[PDB]
Design a protein around this ligand. Structure first.
Ligand SMILES: *[C@@H]1O[C@H](CO)[C@@H](O[C@@H]2O[C@H](CO)[C@@H](O)[C@H](O)[C@H]2NC(C)=O)[C@H](O)[C@H]1NC(C)=O
Ligand SMILES: *[C@@H]1O[C@H](CO)[C@@H](O[C@@H]2O[C@H](CO)[C@@H](O)[C@H](O)[C@H]2NC(C)=O)[C@H](O)[C@H]1NC(C)=O
Ligand SMILES: [Ca+2]
Ligand SMILES: [Ca+2]
Ligand SMILES: [Ca+2]
Ligand SMILES: [Ca+2]
Ligand SMILES: [Ca+2]
Ligand SMILES: [Ca+2]
Ligand SMILES: [Cl-]
Ligand SMILES: [Cl-]
Ligand SMILES: [Cl-]
Ligand SMILES: [Cl-]
Ligand code: NA
Lengths: 221, 192
């Protein structure tokens, strides 16, 4: 068997020729391992695939075409309609701060349901478009607790290739992982690429996490 | 007199003046000018279905948001959520036999990372009164805090109260967070 150790790209498998010569052919989706519900994945076509094996077998069958070239794994789970991740869903605050925020919101609710002056201005941020960002603005100025984590996330992603900008393919693992963790879809190129050139610089990334320009420093990468 | 009462109904006119940012969302998915106006409205409607149901839901105007998931409600420490994120990103970059199924099944069986926090959250909420069950008034502040913090709406009494008695026991709570019965333990709750 010449197919032993003959490597093939994902969605392809090695099959011997009528002459015994090994060839990479598309994988038949029927041969994909049986699937459990949580194996499901959502493709960039907003189609749900039973598993990653099924998606790449489909992509292979579609090699050479627009839909084939476009199809990628988008995130884990079935395709869903979900809101855009916020910055703090991407890069979280310490648990102590999340308990504090939860407690003032709960306390603010109990005072208003079936104190009010204390947290009045706080109440009116929630009717705003970015309540948590504004309430946590002072925290975001701390280097060890916020600024450095924001830089470290950029440099962790800027690897394919490392060039001080992030592209779609570099952000795709982060997008895929936040759906199960946070039930939100990142939209970095709708929100953090204001010149629409499809490359996110450190300045664009920092601004999108609300870090002042004076605190953005390429030496931390 | 109760909120919205002053016992006659409160005149909406005497409600403090309202700014746009005073708006609130009622459980009817209606936007009210402020919390005062919502309960004044509730009073004018006392005695009816629409009247009895109406409660404060969350601050701000009503919006479209999905139902909260288990991992949105349970707040993890940074170190553990960072570990979980890096594992998931590694599973993506690669693309067990069913990695995501196995990862989440094992995670939800882990006591220090998940089972105990699910029990702690029940017990933090079970205070009015402390009686080993959760009612609407105990879960309503958690719901309102999760809208701004997680952009999701909890639906505890539609999904975690299968006998429809308006009380959520520890057993119902655990099952609704995907905890096996063998791992539900009243000894993990704050002492009596
Ligand atoms: C991608 O697919 C998901 C799943 O079918 C869509 O979410 C559905 O959207 C419809 C509205 O057209 C709603 O009635 C359903 O409740 C949604 N289902 C879920 C599970 O969220 C989503 O809208 C699709 N997005 C696009 C752009 O096609
Ligand atoms: C609760 O009310 C809000 C506000 O009217 C609804 O949100 C809107 O939904 C419509 C159509 O579904 C959209 O055109 C609007 O853009 C939405 N507004 C916002 C602010 O998101 C929401 O759908 C209602 N909730 C339910 C469950 O019906
Ligand atoms: Ca790069
Ligand atoms: Ca750009
Ligand atoms: Ca109780
Ligand atoms: Ca969320
Ligand atoms: Ca019950
Ligand atoms: Ca649940
Ligand atoms: Cl190949
Ligand atoms: Cl984080
Ligand atoms: Cl923490
Ligand atoms: Cl916010
Ligand atoms: Na969480």
């Amino acid at each position: 068997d010449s197919c032993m150790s003959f490597q093939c790209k994902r969605g392809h498998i090695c099959k011997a020729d009528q002459q015994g010569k090994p060839h990479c052919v598309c994988q038949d989706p029927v041969t994909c391992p049986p699937t459990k519900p949580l194996d499901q994945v959502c493709g960039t076509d907003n189609q749900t695939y039973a598993s990653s094996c099924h998606l790449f077998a489909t992509k292979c069958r579609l090699e050479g075409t627009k839909k084939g070239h476009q199809l990628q794994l988008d995130y884990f789970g079935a395709c869903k309609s979900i809101p855009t991740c916020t910055d703090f869903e991407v890069i979280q605050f310490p648990l102590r701060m999340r308990d504090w925020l939860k407690n003032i919101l709960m306390q603010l609710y109990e005072a208003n349901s079936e104190v009010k002056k204390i947290y009045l201005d706080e109440k009116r941020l929630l009717a705003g478009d970015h309540p948590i960002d504004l309430l946590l603005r002072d925290f975001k100025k701390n280097y060890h607790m916020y600024v450095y984590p924001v830089h470290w996330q950029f440099s962790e992603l800027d690897q394919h290739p490392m060039d001080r900008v992030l592209t779609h393919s570099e952000l795709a693992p982060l997008r895929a992982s936040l759906v199960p963790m946070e039930h939100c879809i990142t939209r970095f190129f709708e929100e953090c690429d204001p010149n629409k050139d499809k490359h996110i610089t450190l300045k664009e990334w920092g601004h999108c996490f609300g870090i002042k320009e004076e605190d953005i420093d390429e030496n931390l990468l």
